[PDB]
Amino acid sequence: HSWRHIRAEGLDSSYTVLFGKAEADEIFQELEKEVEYFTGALARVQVFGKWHSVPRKQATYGDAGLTYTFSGLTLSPKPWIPVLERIRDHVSGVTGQTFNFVLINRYKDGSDHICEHRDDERELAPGSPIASVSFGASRDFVFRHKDSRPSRRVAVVRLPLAHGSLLMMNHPTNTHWYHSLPVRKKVLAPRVNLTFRKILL
DNA sequence: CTGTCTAACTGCG
DNA sequence: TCGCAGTTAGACA
Ligand SMILES: O=C(O)CCC(=O)C(=O)O
Ligand SMILES: [Mn+2]
């Protein structure tokens, strides 16, 4: 309850803190201890004709048989684990929404980042929201309008994502706006992000 | 065969 | 420290 509502032209989102420091610290430790990340061949993507190692670590968990694909990289979900189930069920019991898949991004520090994109693929249940839960260091998250890089120019939306926070990205946000987690060199500590989604069978 | 798009980078300013 | 400009060991419709 008591969400901060992020609203603009074709942008509907909401931000809330889910946990206090003591709890979120406990979940963060467990994530650090328990999550396994893809390496080598499953850590490379194809963008602008070139193959790049990703500047971060990624993991996927979810219901058996599923798959997710972005930028010429196809990831297969590992079976659920308690710490992840715990978070999922908490987000479910607060939003009403259900989820069968989570992508985990770990930025060891402000050098690690994700370039701007739309969480795009049609393998994603249409109309469904995306649940972004963040642990560890606060990191600036940035929204930017599609046609703004620039015919008619809507203002960029900056937002800090805190320890134990939840960002909800409701439809139609992801058709209209791009998002990135830009480099911040002042940031020395790790951060783990869990974006929960609903995937089609 | 044309045009729209790119979850990433270097090399700047 | 930040982020813009210009992408392209090109994909795809
Ligand atoms: O790091 C985040 O806050 C979200 C990362 C992201 O954009 C994604 O999981 O696709
Ligand atoms: Mn994303």
Structure tokens at A197: 């989604």
- The domains found in chain A, sorted by start residue, are 1-201 (2.60.120.590)
Q: Which residue in A99, A58, A98, A100 sits closest to A79, CA to CA?
A: A100
Q: CB under 6 Å to ligand 1: residues?
A: A 103, 105, 114, 119, 132, 134, 141, 161, 179, 181, 193, 195
The CA–CA distances, whole Å, from A3 to A23, A184, A199 equal 20, 26, 26
Residue nearest to nucleotide B7 (CA to C1'): A117
- Say how far apart CA A195 and CA A146 lie, in whole Å: 21
CA of A114 to the centre of ligand 2 (A): 8
Residue with tokens 């015919």: A151
Angle in degrees, CA A27, A67, A64, rounded to 5:
70
Q: Whose alpha carbon is nearest atom 8 of ligand 1?
A: A195
Residue of A114, A124, A157, A191 best suited for mutating to test ligand 1, as the one with most atoms within 8 Å of CB: A114
Determine the nucleotide nearest to A116 by Cα–C1' distance. Answer: B7
Long-range contacts: A37-44, Cβ < 8 Å, 24+? Answer: A37/A104, A37/A106, A38/A75, A42/A73, A42/A75, A44/A73
- From CA A201, how far away is CA A198, in angstroms rounded? 10
A68 is in an annotated binding site: yes
Return the residue whose CA atom lies nearest to atom 4 of ligand 1.
Answer: A193
The nucleotide lying nearest A51 (C-alpha to C1') is: C9
Can you name the residues that pair with A78 across neighbouring β-strands? A61
Chain discontinuities in chain A, listed by preceding residue (C to N exceeding 2.5 Å): 149
State phi, psi for A31 to the nearest 5 degrees: -55, -50
Residue type, A56: R
A62, amino acid identity: G
Angle between helices A21-34 and A82-95 (to 10 degrees): 140
